[PDB]
Structures are given as structure tokens and as C-alpha cells.
Amino acid sequence: VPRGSAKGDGVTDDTAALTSALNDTPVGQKINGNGKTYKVTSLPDISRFINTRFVYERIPGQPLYYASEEFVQGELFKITDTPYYNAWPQDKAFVYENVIYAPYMGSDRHGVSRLHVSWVKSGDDGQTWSTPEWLTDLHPDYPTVNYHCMSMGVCRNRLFAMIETRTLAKNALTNCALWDRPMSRSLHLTGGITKAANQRYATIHVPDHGLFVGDFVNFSNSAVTGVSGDMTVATVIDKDNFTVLTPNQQTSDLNNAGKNWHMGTSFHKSPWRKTDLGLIPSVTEVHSFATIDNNGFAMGYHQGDVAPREVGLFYFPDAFNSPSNYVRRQIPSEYEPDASEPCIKYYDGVLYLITRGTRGDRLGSSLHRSRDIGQTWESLRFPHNVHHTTLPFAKVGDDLIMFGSERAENEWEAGAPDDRYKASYPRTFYARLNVNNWNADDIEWVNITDQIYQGGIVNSGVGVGSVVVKDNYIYYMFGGEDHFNPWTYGDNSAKDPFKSDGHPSDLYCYKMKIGPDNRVSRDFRYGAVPNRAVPVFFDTNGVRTVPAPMEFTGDLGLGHVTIRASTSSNIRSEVLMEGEYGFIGKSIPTDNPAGQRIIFCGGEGTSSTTGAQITLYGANNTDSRRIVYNGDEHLFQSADVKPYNDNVTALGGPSNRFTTAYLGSNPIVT
Amino acid sequence: VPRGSAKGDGVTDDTAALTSALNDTPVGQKINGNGKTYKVTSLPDISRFINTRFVYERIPGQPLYYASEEFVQGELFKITDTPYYNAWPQDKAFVYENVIYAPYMGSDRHGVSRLHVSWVKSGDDGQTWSTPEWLTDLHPDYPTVNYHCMSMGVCRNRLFAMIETRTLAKNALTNCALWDRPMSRSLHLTGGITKAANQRYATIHVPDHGLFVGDFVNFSNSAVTGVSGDMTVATVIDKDNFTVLTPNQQTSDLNNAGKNWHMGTSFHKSPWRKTDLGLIPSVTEVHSFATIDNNGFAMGYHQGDVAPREVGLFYFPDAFNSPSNYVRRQIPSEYEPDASEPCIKYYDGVLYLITRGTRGDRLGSSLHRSRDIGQTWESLRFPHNVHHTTLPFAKVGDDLIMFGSERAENEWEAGAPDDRYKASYPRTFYARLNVNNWNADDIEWVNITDQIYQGGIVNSGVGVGSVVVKDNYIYYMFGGEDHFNPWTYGDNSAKDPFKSDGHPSDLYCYKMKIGPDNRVSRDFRYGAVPNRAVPVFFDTNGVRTVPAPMEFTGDLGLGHVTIRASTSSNIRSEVLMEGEYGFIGKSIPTDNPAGQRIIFCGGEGTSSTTGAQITLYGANNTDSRRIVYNGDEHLFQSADVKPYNDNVTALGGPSNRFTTAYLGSNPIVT
Amino acid sequence: VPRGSAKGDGVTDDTAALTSALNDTPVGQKINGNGKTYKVTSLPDISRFINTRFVYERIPGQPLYYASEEFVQGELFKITDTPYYNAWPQDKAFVYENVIYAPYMGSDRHGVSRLHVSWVKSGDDGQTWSTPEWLTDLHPDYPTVNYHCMSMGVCRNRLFAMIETRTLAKNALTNCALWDRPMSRSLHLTGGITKAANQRYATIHVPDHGLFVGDFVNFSNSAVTGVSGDMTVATVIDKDNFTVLTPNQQTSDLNNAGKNWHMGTSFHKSPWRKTDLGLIPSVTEVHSFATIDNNGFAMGYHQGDVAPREVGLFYFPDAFNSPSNYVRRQIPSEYEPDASEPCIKYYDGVLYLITRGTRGDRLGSSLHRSRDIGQTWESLRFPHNVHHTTLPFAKVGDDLIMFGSERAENEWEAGAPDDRYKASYPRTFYARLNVNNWNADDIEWVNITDQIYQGGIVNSGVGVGSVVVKDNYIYYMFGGEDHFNPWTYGDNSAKDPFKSDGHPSDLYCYKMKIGPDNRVSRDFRYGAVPNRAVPVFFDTNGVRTVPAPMEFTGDLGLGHVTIRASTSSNIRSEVLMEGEYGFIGKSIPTDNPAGQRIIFCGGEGTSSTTGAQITLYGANNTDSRRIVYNGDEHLFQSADVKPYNDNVTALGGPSNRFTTAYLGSNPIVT
Ligand SMILES: CC(=O)N[C@H]1[C@H]([C@H](O)[C@H](O)CO)O[C@](O)(C(=O)O)C[C@@H]1O
Ligand SMILES: [Cl-]
Ligand SMILES: [Cl-]
Ligand SMILES: [Cl-]
Ligand SMILES: [Cl-]
Ligand SMILES: [Cl-]
Ligand SMILES: [Cl-]
Ligand SMILES: [Cl-]
Ligand SMILES: [Cl-]
Numbered sequence A, B, C: 001v002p003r004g005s006a007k008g009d010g011v012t013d014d015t016a017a018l019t020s021a022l023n024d025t026p027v028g029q030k031i032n033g034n035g036k037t038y039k040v041t042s043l044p045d046i047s048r049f050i051n052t053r054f055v056y057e058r059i060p061g062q063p064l065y066y067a068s069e070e071f072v073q074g075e076l077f078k079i080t081d082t083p084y085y086n087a088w089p090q091d092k093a094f095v096y097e098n099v100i101y102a103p104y105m106g107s108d109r110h111g112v113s114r115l116h117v118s119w120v121k122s123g124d125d126g127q128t129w130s131t132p133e134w135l136t137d138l139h140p141d142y143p144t145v146n147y148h149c150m151s152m153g154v155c156r157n158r159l160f161a162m163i164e165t166r167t168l169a170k171n172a173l174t175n176c177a178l179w180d181r182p183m184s185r186s187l188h189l190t191g192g193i194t195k196a197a198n199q200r201y202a203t204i205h206v207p208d209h210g211l212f213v214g215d216f217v218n219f220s221n222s223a224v225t226g227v228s229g230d231m232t233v234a235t236v237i238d239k240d241n242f243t244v245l246t247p248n249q250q251t252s253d254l255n256n257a258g259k260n261w262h263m264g265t266s267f268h269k270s271p272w273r274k275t276d277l278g279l280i281p282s283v284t285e286v287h288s289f290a291t292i293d294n295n296g297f298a299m300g301y302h303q304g305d306v307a308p309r310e311v312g313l314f315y316f317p318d319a320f321n322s323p324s325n326y327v328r329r330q331i332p333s334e335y336e337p338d339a340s341e342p343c344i345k346y347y348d349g350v351l352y353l354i355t356r357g358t359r360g361d362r363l364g365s366s367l368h369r370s371r372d373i374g375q376t377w378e379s380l381r382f383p384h385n386v387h388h389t390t391l392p393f394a395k396v397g398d399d400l401i402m403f404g405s406e407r408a409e410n411e412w413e414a415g416a417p418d419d420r421y422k423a424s425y426p427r428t429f430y431a432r433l434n435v436n437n438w439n440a441d442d443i444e445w446v447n448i449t450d451q452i453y454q455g456g457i458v459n460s461g462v463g464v465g466s467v468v469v470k471d472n473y474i475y476y477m478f479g480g481e482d483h484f485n486p487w488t489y490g491d492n493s494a495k496d497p498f499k500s501d502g503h504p505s506d507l508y509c510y511k512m513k514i515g516p517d518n519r520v521s522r523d524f525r526y527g528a529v530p531n532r533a534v535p536v537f538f539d540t541n542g543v544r545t546v547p548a549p550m551e552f553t554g555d556l557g558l559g560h561v562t563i564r565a566s567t568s569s570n571i572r573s574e575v576l577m578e579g580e581y582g583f584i585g586k587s588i589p590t591d592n593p594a595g596q597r598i599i600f601c602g603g604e605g606t607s608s609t610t611g612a613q614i615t616l617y618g619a620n621n622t623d624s625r626r627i628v629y630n631g632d633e634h635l636f637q638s639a640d641v642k643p644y645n646d647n648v649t650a651l652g653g654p655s656n657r658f659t660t661a662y663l664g665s666n667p668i669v670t
């Protein structure tokens, strides 16, 4: 009886041939699928294959594709590991001057409680990531409302973000504001600085500087007197020229033409410009960002709280001069039902928009393109009711490359019920769509990594990510959970991140090659002590030393404490107390309450021989509320020595007589 | 002259053919052994092979097997990295509700000094591990005695552990106690809550809840008035039902039949139940844990301090109602000499037990099975005097899969001398034994990873591990060292973990695939800042901020300190001092002792213009033990102003006269 | 038309055949080059190949070689990750008693500002690295001068280092000192301790001990009364024998012949021996270290500030007896122009020296060998003006194996201009040179890894590394940057490491196999919480606990603080203040300045019912500079109660009368 071999044609049922190959092959052999796609009736032991793709209909009629290792050149990274609920990169990521930014929200729940808009960054093309930075503080009216952000990007060297205010109680939108700030840059320039005689201002020529009055500028080597060090923008002449105020003036004009110098800008030392847009009507969320040109950008939006839904974009044609001016452009009405959270990007004059579907039992995600910044559209529907995921994407050559994640295992397919309240392994997919062919009927969703959905609460941090390209690589930054329960149903209904394992959602990044890499590898194994967040050095005496300034805001218990010389040329040790008032007090002792007291001493030991002392006795002391003042001099400066009340307390007593009183006049007795 | 090729039959000496292949092949080629076993006279360059096993008799007559990369689908992880002596997972590991637990002891030595029973956990199937948790405090009678534990596991949703007390001086057992605690869980339930009219208790139906009176229970969405939030168990009716006391009562019966709600339990918020078993006679160590059924479990033990040895188990048939009731069952007497630390597990009605051998020159580890919970046995001896290692194991299909580690290199074989006081690379092995065949004569120990033994002290933390299965993977959690000396013979005879590199022993986990993985990979490269142990966020002002509560128990030196507003709606900054008393004092200055003092001020600066001051002068000050009180009012409230002694000190002096005294009566002169 | 296949002969242009193979092969296939070298006209997609080398002339006439993955058995590791400018391992690395040491300088710039000579270490053959240790403090005359070191190594169990002093302003050398210290060791010895009757000293026989009077020695199990615990060397008899002073004497001679005991030495508990060499004339930098024998060593040097350059070594023939005695030996004059920073090593009686070239447009690096410790030489010039890199190396068999790194991309080649002020991916190379053939004309530089050069400043931390061999592996420890700007041109012209991402330079280690590995792999994936730098344990109450002593030197802000019992059998909590004086003060409140004060209390709460209180009111309080003293007794001990000034302040006032004064005599009125 002849046997068939595996065909790898995506149609022949290769299950039997693959099973026989697995049975007949040692488990450690990597079975090479030769880049082919093999149709199976259930997924085999994928781990034993390389360079293989499977096609499988978990739900009949709904083929999906599954990658073995090395089928794609790609890898998953974990990029945050913090106790907050870290989720929702949607749709904020960007690349600026060689750094990959993964903004997100770190909260305690699906909501704005404990939330900071945050980012981590990579300086090495995604191998390692930075310590989280908070971009927002808690709102001044916390805990009634707090911030939220799903739209951020860069236009002409400024970060722009739609900073929403939402209620803690219901996550209801109450305000939209456009916040923007210059990005930090170092510029290495030749010429461009002039300073007219007999006045103090200098004009600085920097094309497309993106700075406003009051923004930070640092100068080095300018060769123009007074244009030096940390300065600020005094005026903006035009988009290419600004002025600074110098401390001095010369009797000759100055001009550094032909001379090389350096300028620096700063995100951190420049304020946000904040433009209040009010409660923009018919908006639930602002989401995604598409830079259009040197003057403006678009932000996606949807309205989904009441019928009828809207989905579209807001275009800000001149965000520099006119940040409050935008125009609303909706996608066609047929595609607005059951839709939210559009991802938008702009390439070669074409605005592309992809929706999130809200329901697995109704038509789902759709894709739209426009050559007039959303006034008119061409549209298509993805097959099979793609739902619960945003589809962030980039354009690489003729393809859109889009990523999505089911939120819990087995939810992706049309008709699949939600699968919550138990642990599972949700699938993450990508797909390519050729914009010339403009037809998604044949789309191939390829499962490239699986995440964990923890199951302790109904909500999921899996997915809802963001995509960028840098060089020859595409990056999908997105959430994933672990098996550690947050104990919301348990001992942590308050959702305190700092109890036990905190919240399981953290960020990941799938780094996928999308064109040739013409250099030797930069890859390394990380073997260092991570020494950025809390920088420690063993000092020459063998003690761990942290030289960075730090804030500890949580309750602290300390053991033996020494306050070292630190202040005014190190002459003194110093503790400063904030608030309206400071309090230094003494707990009730557990074992010997009768001793409760604090000894304050001007010398090194508890014996009064070492220094003057004042001892404040607690109420629980045998000598309740005593004070003993013990010095070799007691000198009362600047004021009379008085009783607090009138004609109630005495000087001395019958068993505590003063020897005498030295007076410049007899007592005044009344 | 013909040449032979490598046969890969485990018998032909393939040394010459492999040497010629290595010589004739580029060094970067991965030479595929096709899953075969090659007999060699010494190990070749294993790194150049994939999918190859070698058989080699380092000691003639004692073949052992050696895996190249990919021969097994498996990988080693490092899972702790702390300065304690972290060793002895033996034999405590378990999996509970999707989390892998690796309990161990972190001490300063082979002994109970500085010891905490600890664990780390994995929420992602072994890729990453948690911050260590201390399960025990130092014993109340430390430093005479302290805790120790080698037996822990789960029965009916409770953790059970044999918590031993041992002397620091000799590691002698002084007490055994069974400690148990409910495991944390979230349950998503329908119905089961009833509350009878006109009383305050509610009955909660939760099958096999495993809770006792006083244990923590949290309720959400119960739809039963008063059954809400954090509560405790008031009564246990039976194994499936308990009651809680609510704050109120209704005039109608309540019943949430058909309604979905959530319950949570908590390990952390429930006390241990502690059952004192006394000094169980003829016991050296309790070790390993086998869950038997819904009511009880067995724990292994041995007696090895005096002749004759015992090895066996204690069976607790109903640990819930009767934690103090157990029965002792020994293995057959022929297998008790030179034996200790049995590993026990129960599968399909069969109790399996594997011993540790104590000597390489006497019969070693043996394997035993019983169908009556250790009343009768069938037994076999492993060949070649397996010794110095426990053999934790699991049953997967018809095989026992067992793991062991030599403690230092070249100790595994029968007759091999101990190899201590120099650095080496000990071998870790696994083997499979088919329970139907029940014969170990042919057993194949396969070296799958090598560890380091540091050599600075005679003892080794290598090995003595624990095994669990989760899904399609088996996990061996075990110790290994590094080359960093603890300096016991050196500057750290006190064995302080916090000096230099502390102690070199840390935990590892070998994760081995033992059945098909029918999902796309979950694997990631970890590129995040680890931000769980000391969670740091760069605040909006650019300063590292830790929001978690923390305890620093080691001596601290601080620089400039600001105590921020924190307490009573943030009105005040606050420092509280514990102990019988607090002391705030002043070191002897190194450069200017004549200035020794502390200035206390109610305002912001050292100038008295900023606030009232009291300055306590040290004994070394030129103005020795002076006190200066400097305010614009000095008001003595609640008591007379008195000298401490009678008729010894004065008011004023001849060069420090008060202008007058304002009195309500003439002085009382006596 | 026939097509040609790839020849892999290093000469045929294989570009077309490789392009066609890439086009015709799935992207996930690993294309095996069979260890051959393929000539190309530009580098193809290297990532798709394994076991392949390319030869390519980026600059015509200058072939360089490029490795795909697995062509060499090697891997890159990142080994530091700290905010300092971490660079310049040159040329200090060494291996001692199984530990790999990577010394470096951590500063804020190319200069000695903020600099500590530092190291990290590996205890596991390079997989993981330790927390940085500072070897030097800031110089006592900082900020005028600070330390610097490029030469360090081991001779007869002591670390030796050339510790230079240099100016912060210009990095000008002002002093050279030889610093040395015993290395930490544990010795397991038999016999060798004698103690003559009726006196207190014992003689300790330890061959080649390398200890001096005053160095630390610890003894265990000596079997010689009084030779026990932590001791110090009293005398050195000879290189093999020293004495210690014991506390006691016996009437019989003692001798532990035949008895096993343990000795420990300590780097940390022994002082440096510091030998001032003055400002050695005609020296710019001391660099690299070659151990010669049991008595001494050589250190490289160059002079490059004024013409004519020198390059050579200083030989210290007996550094133990005569640390100030050395002899200067130059390389031949033709090789001194445009040369610096020689690397030197000694093998089998031959001293090898390799220079750094300073210019890409003049003859560059050269190699020299000597059989008389630099009195005479044989020499060769590397082709093509190798420049800007040191070439650290080791000898393995008949080959020198040397490593170098361009500092920014595309600088390696002769005639290539410097490429600064923009981000790039510099190439790192190695090469082999057969010492028998002694001809570099044919040398093959193989690009094995690429680094990042950040571009925000002109200088680069890339490269300038150090090489060691351990077992069958060679290790190149060297710098590399990331894309995170230091913001020197920006908001951090002060170069504070602790702002934003600090400085991008960190250390890496390329671990390359250079001979057979006859053991199963030791490799692991690191999945632990790093818990050495700031060791955290979740205590039994669920709070992160750090038991290590620590120093925080940066400004700290704290929230609620509790000072726990810690001192004198835990009777008290304690804070000690250093400096000339301590200051505890109160900020000006932001919201309610009128309340400014500190309440000091001997009990637990702000109510005076809990304890005696003193409240110091700030100047901004409504009751400006008031003091209220509130106790149930006010007892003034040890001194009169006096006004500070004479006949200026009163006792009481008309609305604050004391009831009376209890006196032992009438007032003294004058
Ligand atoms: C925070 C604070 O200032 N507490 C003070 C209280 C409050 O002023 C009073 O309780 C208000 O009702 O009064 C005292 O106990 C008192 O007068 O003896 C002193 C104490 O320092
Ligand atoms: Cl997310
Ligand atoms: Cl939206
Ligand atoms: Cl949805
Ligand atoms: Cl969707
Ligand atoms: Cl201070
Ligand atoms: Cl262990
Ligand atoms: Cl035991
Ligand atoms: Cl043993």
C-alpha cells in the first residue's frame, strides 16, 4: 500500500504524513518545512518544526495560520515588569531620532484609578528598555477624575498628545486637551547666529525648530558673545528663526557664519503647551495619530456610548499656529456600527484607517483609504468579524503589515464566545494586505506568538497595541498577562499594585524583520546587573551606595539611621520637614511602656556626659509627660521666660527650690 | 585502507570517526548526530554537535550518557540571585492553579543560622521568577534554634508543611509541627448563598473549600445583603459549606440561586494552623510530600543519627479533622542502611519512594512501590551506588522521570572519592524507568547540564532539588554555585550574606519537554527593567520614585533628607520612633569637634530669623553641654518651672539677671 | 545560458549567485555557507546565513571579512548597565582563581570628573556579572585632580595597578603611583604552623604568600593554640614564611605537621601599599600589564603630548622588595610616530607589544616581540593604517588572537575620515597572527559584532578594551554605546549621570571559543529577580524588606517614616547626625504658612495627652517664633535657669504671672 508524503500545498490534508514523520524522527531533530504551508486537522507538536507554517480551521470555514520557529525572522521581548496594570500602548508608539518609544498607561484597573500616562524606550533597536517614566501626574481633582491618553505622536520636532480627563467612577470623558512639548535634540550646526550691535538679542537660524517662546535652548561654542549655556526662547520670528535674550551687548555686529557650534533642546526643561478643547461633542475616545506634514496631523476617534456610533478622525491642519482648530471626518456610515478605536497612518498622500470591531457576531474590523484626508474613502471589510482588537499597522512597500491579538484564547473567530474567568493562552497574529490588490477576502492571519490571559477578572490587558518601523524592522508593542492573580476577588479588592504580585499585565514587543539586514549582528545576551533604576555601587568600604536622588513615597520602616554631612560645603547634616507642620513622636513600647520617651542629645551617646539633652517622656512612662532639660547652661534668648497661663503655675516647689533669683528689680507682685 | 564511519550504536568505539569528522568539518558547522548514541573513550567537543548523545565510561564499568544541545528539548534557567545561601528545594515544589512554586531555604550555611523558609514562583511556565518571599520568621528563641523545612505541598486547597525546629549549634531536631494555610484563589460561582430571615448569618456552598474558622473570605456581587467585601469564616458546617456573620438581617429569606458572583480566599490574610507534634521519636528529617486524596497526604522521613537507620513515610489520613494523627511506615530493612531523604509521590493508587544513598562505596539509592500506602512494598536497587543526591521525580505515562546532581565534579560513580575544596563543574542527570518493566539494571543516566561547585568550603549547595510537571513540561528546581567565594576562610567567617558576593548557592530550574506542545511559542527575551522588587518610576520632575512601602533593616547612611507631607490628609510630615525609647544624637565631628551641636528649628534655615530654635551643644563643643532656647516667646504650659534638685541651682546669675519676676504672691523663702 | 553557482573561494565574485539563492529561498531558511568565504560587492542579508564568511572591499584595496551567525562559536554579552560613562577596560582585565575581572573607569566624560576606577566580575565564565565595585575614591584634592588607571594585573597573589593623578581641566598627568594589595584567597593546607614554647609568635609556611606586614590573615582548624580567627601579619621572614602574634604562650613547642587547616587572605581588609613614583618624566599614560615571573611585571606606556613620541614599557624586576625600581624600554624609533597605548603580554619568554595608531592617514598599529624584556625587538607593521583602537590580545597555540573596534562606523580603513556627531553602528573585529610566520601582510580582520556610537558628542566609549583567556574561551571586554543622548548639548551640560538616561557608554564582553569544550553545557537563561544590588525579600507581612546596609548619598525625599528598634539589644530606635552640626528644620508651608511649626513629642500622637511636647513655631506662623513647652513636669537639671542676656528679659509678665517662686534665699537684686 503506497503512503503519501506531506505536500505542503495548503490544501492536501498533511496530518497523517506529519504524524508519521514525527513518530519516525528523533524528538531533538528540527524538522524543516521548507517554508511551505501544511494543512492539518489539529495543530501538531509545533516545537519540533522550523521554517514551517500550518493552516488549520479550529472553527470550520475559518482558516488561520500558525508559525513554527524561524518561519518569520522575528522574536518576542518582554519590555515592562512593574506592579501596575500596564496596558494600552494603543495607539501611541513612535520613533524619534533613533529611539523607539512605547507609551502606555499604568493604572490599577481598566479605568483611570492610580493612572499615569507612561513610557518605556529602547536605545538599542528593541533589545533592552528603559525604566518607566511618568508623563502625567494625577489630575488636580483626583480622585474624582484622572488623565487618559490613546493618541500621541510627533510633528515638526514636538510631541503632541490628546490628554483626556475621565471619571474614576465610570471612565466617562469630561475634557479633551491637546498637550505638546519640544522633543530633546542635539544639533551640530554651522553659522546661523547673528547679534546686532548695541543691543542684547541674538537671532538663531534653525530650520523647522518647532520651539515656542519660553522653551529651553542650550548653546555651546557659538562664537557669539552672550549666546552660551542654558537659555530660553524670547521670540519666534518664523518657523526657521527665533531669538534669545543675552546678558550683554557689543559695539560691533556679530555673526558666526562658517563656524561650527552646538544647540540642545529639552523636553524636560520646557513646559507643556496645553490647549483646552473642552468636552468635544460626540466623542468617547481619541485614539491613534497620523503625522500629515510639517504643520499638522490627524487623530482618530470614535463615539460608542449612544446610538449612532461615529468613527473617524480629527485633522489639525496647523497645530503650531492654531492648536484649537480641527475638522471632523467620519468613515462611511455602513462601517460605523459595532466599531471603535481606529488606527490611522499617512503614507505618500494616502490616509489609511483600520477599525476595531466590537462584536464577534456582527461585521467587524474594516480598512479605509483616502486621498483627501478623510473627506472621501474607499473601503473593505475583513472577513469573519475581526473583533475586540485594534489593528495597528505600518506600510512597507506595497503592503500594510498589521498586528492584532485576541484578548483571551479562542475569541478571534467569528461567532466565538468570549472566554473569560479562566487562564488561557491568547493568540497574537499579523497579516499583510497588498494595497494595489485592495481585497481582504483572502487575508492570511498568522499566529506568531501566544500570550497569557490570567483569568482572575473579566478584563484583559492582552493586546491593544501600537506599531512602528525602524530601519528594516517592524515592532508591535502590546500587552500580555502572566498567571499571577491580582486578588481583586481576594485580599486586594482595593487593587493596590504594591501588594503581593500586583497586576499581571505588562508590555511586550514583537520585533519582526521586514527587509534585509546588511550588517553583522548587534545582538547580545544581557548579563549585567540592571543599575539604572536604583544605581548601586559597592563603595571602597564594601557598602552598597546609591548616588542618585530618590523619592520614597510609600510608608518606610528604617533601622539604625545615620544622617551624613551633606549641606553647605558639607558642614552639616540636615533633615527638612514639609507640610503645614512636622511631627516627631514616639510609639507606645510593646514590652516596656513604662519607659516611653525620646532623648534628644547634642552629643553622641545616651549618657548626658556626651552632650546636652532634652528628654520628652510619653504619657505611658511612669513619669508621665515629664520633661527633663539637662545642660551645663540653660540660656533663654530673645524672650521672657513665662508660664503659658496667668497665675496658675509656679517657679519651683517646696521640694524643688531655686537657691535664689538674680533680678535687676524687685518682683512685681499683683 | 578503508576507513569506518561512525556507527552510533552505543557499542562500536566511534572515537576515531568522530575525531576525523571534527577535524574535517568547519568549527561553526552543527554536526547532527541523528538522535543516536555514540560510544567514545573520552568526551569530544560536545559544543559542535546537535541532536547527539555520547556514552562514555569515565570509570570503567560505569557507562553514563552525555547530551549535546537539542538532543532533549530542554533548557536551564537561573531562578534566584540573592546573597543568602539559597539551596535545598528538596522536596517542596508544587504547582497550584497555574503557578509553579519553588520553595527553598535561604540561610548563611548548611544549618539554620539566618534561615528563612522561602519561595520564588513562576507565572509564565518557568521563563521568569518572582521576588523571594519569606514564609517563616526567625524562631522566637533564635539564636538557640530556628526553623527548617523539607516537606511541603497542597491538599484540598491548603498548603501543608512540616516546620521543624533545629539547633543552630548542631542542626539537631528539637520539634516537629504541621503548619497549614489556605491557598489564595478566586472563584467565579453561580448560586450557593442563603441567608435565613431575621438572623445575621449566611451559608456559603463551596465544594472542598478547605477553609477553617477565622480564615479570610472576600465576596463580590453576591446578591445577598451583608455578604460583601472582606469577611471571615464564622463556622464550618461540612467540607462543602461554611457560614459568615453579616452585619444585618432582613425579614425575608435570601438565596442567590442562578446568580453569578465571586469569592476570594487569601493565604496572606489567614493565619497558619499550627499543630505541635512534639519531638517525633526516631526522626532526623521530614522530607518530601505526596498528596493521597481529598483528606490527607504522606511525608517522607529518615533517621540517620544513630544505628539502625530508618527510612519511610508518615501518612496523615485525615489532616483536616485530625492533623496530629499519623502512622509510620518504613521501607524494607535491607534498603535502610546508608539511606536518607526519601522522595515520595502517589499516582493511580501507587506510592513510589526513592532514597538518597549516603556512601559511594555501599549500596545506594533504591526505588520502592506500594499499593497500600507503605504497608507492603516491591523494591529495586539502582546499580552503582547512587549517592549524595536525592532523586525527585514525577510519573509521565509509564515512566518515572527522575533527576539528580552530583555535589561536586566526578562524585557520581560508585567508588568515586569526594572531590571538595577546589572549584569544579558537577554533572546533573536525569533518567527514565518504565514501571511495567520494573528493572533498573539497564538505567541510563543522561547528563543534561553542568553546574559549578565553588570549593571555598566543603559543603555544596548543588542539587538536592524538587520536581513538578505542568502541562507538557517537567521542571527540576535545584541548587548550583558560582565561582565567587563566600570568604568563610577569609574575611567573612561570620558568614554575613551582605558582605562582598555573599554566598554562591542559588537556584536553577531545568525545564524539559515531555509531551507535545500544540501551540505557537510563548517564549520571549526579557528586555525589561526588573521593577517588582524596588519599583521605580521617573516622576514628571525627572526623579526616581518608589511608591511601594519598604523596610530597610540594615544600617543606613543618608545624605540630605526631606520628610514630605504624608499624614492626616497630608497636613503633616511625620517620623515615629519605636522601641522603649528613641534617641536622636550627634556624632563627634571629625574636623571641628568644637562645633558639635544640633540646631532644632521651627523654620526653614539655620538662622534663628527663620523660626524658633533650641540648640543642644555637645560635650566636645567649646560651650560644653550648653543649651540655648531662642524664641520670641517661651511659654511653659501645664506645669511649674522647677529645678531638678532642691536648693542647688538658681534663677539667673550675676551676669545674667532677669529684669524682674511677675508673681501673684511674694516668694516662698525657706 | 548556463548560470554559475557560488564558489566560496574568496576571489570569484559570488554576488549574483548569492542574490539568486536569496531570491529563490524562503526567508526563514538558514543558508549554510559551509564555512567558506564568499567575495561580494556589497554585504547581502547576513541574517539569512549561518556558518558563512563574506569578504568585501568597502574601500577598494582594503578587504575586510564579515561573519554570519555561527561562523565562529562566540557570543556578545552586555556586562554593565549603569548611568556613569562606563568605558576604558583598556588594558586591565585579568583572571584570578576562577573569576574573570573587567576593570574600567566610570566617569561623566572623557576625563577624570566624577571618576571611580571600578570593576565588574563574572563567577560563571561570563554569563552573568556582578554589581560594580569602586576601587578608588575621589582624590583628596578633587575637583582639581582625580585618579585614572589603564594598567592593572596580578603578580604573586597581589593586585598591582598604576594609579595616576590627572587634572580635571585638561586630563594632564600630575603623578604616578604603584598601588598593590593582596588578593582574597582560601587555602586548604596541611601542616606548616609552628609556635616555639614560652613565646607568643607563630610561623606560618605558605609558599609565595605575597603578603606584607599588616595584611589580613584568617585561620581555622590550625591545631595551634592562639593561631585562630582574624589576625594580621606581624613579620615576613621570606617569600614562603611569615609570622603572626598570638594572644598567649605554652610551655611546649607546637607544630601542626600532618594536620589539615584553612587560611584566608583579604583584599578588602588589607590596606593598599602605595609607592609614589612622582611625575615620571616623558609619560602621557601608563597602559597594559604583563606579568613576567614570581617577582615582577611590565607596564606599557606612551608619551604623546610633545614631539617626539615615545612608546614602550616599564619593567619592575622585583616589585615586592623594590616597587620604586623600574627600567624604561622603548620600541624602535620608526614605530613611535603616531602611536600610543601599547598592549603587552609575556608568553614562553617572549614579550609581545601591539601599538594603537593615532591617524588613519599615516602608518598605524605595529606588533613587536622581544626575548630580553624589551631591550631588542623584531617588528612588523599591520597593513592599512590601523588606528583609533588598542589591540588587546592573547596567545593561544601559535597564534596571537587580537581584538579591535572602530570608534564610529566606517573609520577602520586607511584614509577613512572620522565619522562623528551622528549615530552609527561601529564594527568590532578580531584577527589571528601566526607567530612563526611573523608577517601581517595577509592579515584577515573579521567583523564579529557591531556596536552603537550614539553621536551626541564627538567622543566615543566604543572599544578600547581588554582581553583574557580562561580555559577554552577568550574574552574581549570593551565599551559600546546606545541611542540615548547624554544631553551634553541639551539640558545636561553638567554631565550629571543621574539625570534622564545618564551616559550611554557601557561594557560588553565577546566570549569566543578557542579550543574544545569537553563538558555538557553550563549555559542558562537568566530568569531570576536580580537581588544582589538591593536585596529585597517579601517579609511574612507582605512588605518588601532590604536587610543589607546601604548608603544613599543623593538627595532623598521620604514619606511617612518609622524608625524601628535597632540598637543596644533593640532597646531603642536611633538616629545619629554627622558633620560639625546637625540641623532639623521646617519648610515654609505652601498652603498654610501661618501653621509653620514642628511638634516634638514623647508619645505617639499630635495630642499632648499622648506625651510631653515642645513645639517650635516658624517665623511664618501667626505666633511667630513662639516656643510652647508642654509637660506635666518641667525639670531643669545640672544648671541654673538663666536669660541669655543681662537685665533684658523677665520671669513672667503682667498677663503671665507665676503664682510664686520657691526659693532657699531672698532674691539678689542689683
Ligand atoms: C496638631 C496640633 O497642633 N495639636 C495640638 C493640639 C490641638 O491644637 C488641639 O487638639 C486642637 O483642638 O492641642 C494640644 O494637644 C494642646 O493644646 O495641648 C497640643 C497639640 O500639639
Ligand atoms: Cl495592552
Ligand atoms: Cl477611538
Ligand atoms: Cl470590543
Ligand atoms: Cl477588531
Ligand atoms: Cl544630611
Ligand atoms: Cl540545593
Ligand atoms: Cl528525610
Ligand atoms: Cl550523602
Ligand SMILES: [Cl-]
Residues within 6 Å of the ligand: B355, B356, B357, B358, B364, B365, B386, B387, B388, B389, B390
Ligand atoms: Cl543518592
Ligand SMILES: [Cl-]
Residues within 6 Å of the ligand: B563, B564, B565, B566, B567, B572, B573, B574, B575, C558, C559, C560, C561
Ligand atoms: Cl512624612
Ligand SMILES: [Cl-]
Residues within 6 Å of the ligand: C086, C087, C088, C089, C461, C462, C463, C464, C465, C478, C479, C480
Ligand atoms: Cl571603552
Ligand SMILES: [Cl-]
Residues within 6 Å of the ligand: C285, C286, C287, C300, C301, C302, C340, C341, C342
Ligand atoms: Cl600608554
Ligand SMILES: [Cl-]
Residues within 6 Å of the ligand: C357, C358, C359, C387, C388, C389
Ligand atoms: Cl587615536
Ligand SMILES: [Cl-]
Residues within 6 Å of the ligand: C355, C356, C357, C358, C364, C365, C386, C387, C388, C389, C390
Ligand atoms: Cl590602532
Ligand SMILES: [Cl-]
Residues within 6 Å of the ligand: A558, A559, A560, A561, C563, C564, C565, C566, C567, C572, C573, C574, C575
Ligand atoms: Cl533605629
Ligand code: NA
Residues within 6 Å of the ligand: B081, B082, B083, B084, B085, B086, B502, B503, B504, B505, B506
Ligand atoms: Na546566593
Ligand code: NA
Residues within 6 Å of the ligand: C081, C082, C083, C084, C085, C086, C502, C503, C504, C505, C506
Ligand atoms: Na552608561
